[PDB]
């Protein structure tokens, strides 16, 4: 859902002219201007890309991981730069930014 818009109107497409089209219509609407991409290195799989925003909470992110990889949020733990990412937290208050990368840890059960 990423893509590009020539906002400086210079005829070309630059690095700052990436925008993430959240709603996957052909467009970029005002509310998708903060959307960004972050990666998650899954445990047993590959590195996976998410379309999140800085205001999103961790439960959100996990919600997204489930949708994508089929793991339940209670079974997920997420790690960034050594810190256990806790619930009810924006990922801007952890200082997670465009193209940051997260660690999936999975609980035992058995
Ligand atoms: Tb341009
Ligand atoms: Tb759109």
UniProtKB/Swiss-Prot annotation:
Q: What is the effect of changing residue 100 to A?
A: Prevents phosphorylation in case of mitophagy. Impaired translocation of PRKN to mitochondria
Q: Which residues carry this modification: Phosphoserine?
A: 100
Identify the residue position(s) of the site Essential for function. 103
PTM comment: Phosphorylated at Ser-100 by PINK1 during mitophagy. Phosphorylated ubiquitin specifically binds and activates parkin (PRKN), triggering mitophagy. Phosphorylation does not affect E1-mediated E2 charging of ubiquitin but affects discharging of E2 enzymes to form polyubiquitin chains. It also affects deubiquitination by deubiquitinase enzymes such as USP30. Mono-ADP-ribosylated at the C-terminus by PARP9, a component of the PPAR9-DTX3L complex. ADP-ribosylation requires processing by E1 and E2 enzymes and prevents ubiquitin conjugation to substrates such as histones.
Substituting residue 83 to R results in: No effect on HLTF-mediated polyubiquitination of PCNA
Linked residues for Glycyl lysine isopeptide (Lys-Gly) (interchain with G-Cter in ubiquitin): 41, 46, 62, 64, 68, 83, 98
Its localization reads: Cytoplasm; Nucleus
Sites marked Interacts with activating enzyme: 89, 107
Report the outcome of residue 100 to G.
Phosphomimetic mutant that can recruit PRKN to mitochondria
Q: Which residues form the Ubiquitin-like domain?
A: 36-110
Q: Which domain of life is it from?
A: Eukaryota
Name positions with the PTM (Microbial infection) ADP-ribosylthreonine: 101
Q: What does this chain do? A: Exists either covalently attached to another protein, or free (unanchored). When covalently bound, it is conjugated to target proteins via an isopeptide bond either as a monomer (monoubiquitin), a polymer linked via different Lys residues of the ubiquitin (polyubiquitin chains) or a linear polymer linked via the initiator Met of the ubiquitin (linear polyubiquitin chains).
Protein name listed in UniProt:
Ubiquitin
Native source species: Homo sapiens
Gene that encodes it:
UBA52
Please specify the portion of the entire protein covered by the chain, as first and last position out of its full length: 1 to 75 of 128
């Amino acid at each position: 859902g990423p893509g590009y818009i020539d906002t400086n109107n210079d005829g070309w497409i630059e690095g700052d002219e990436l925008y993430i089209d959240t709603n996957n219509d052909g467009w970029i609407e005002g509310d998708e201007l903060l959307a960004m991409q972050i990666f998650v290195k899954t445990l047993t799989g590959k590195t996976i890309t998410l379309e999140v925003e800085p205001s999103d909470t961790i439960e959100n992110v996990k919600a997204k991981i489930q949708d994508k990889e089929g793991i339940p949020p209670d079974q997920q733990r997420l790690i960034f730069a050594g810190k256990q990412l806790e619930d009810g937290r924006t990922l801007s208050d952890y200082n997670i930014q465009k193209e940051s990368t997260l660690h999936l840890v999975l609980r035992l059960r058995g």
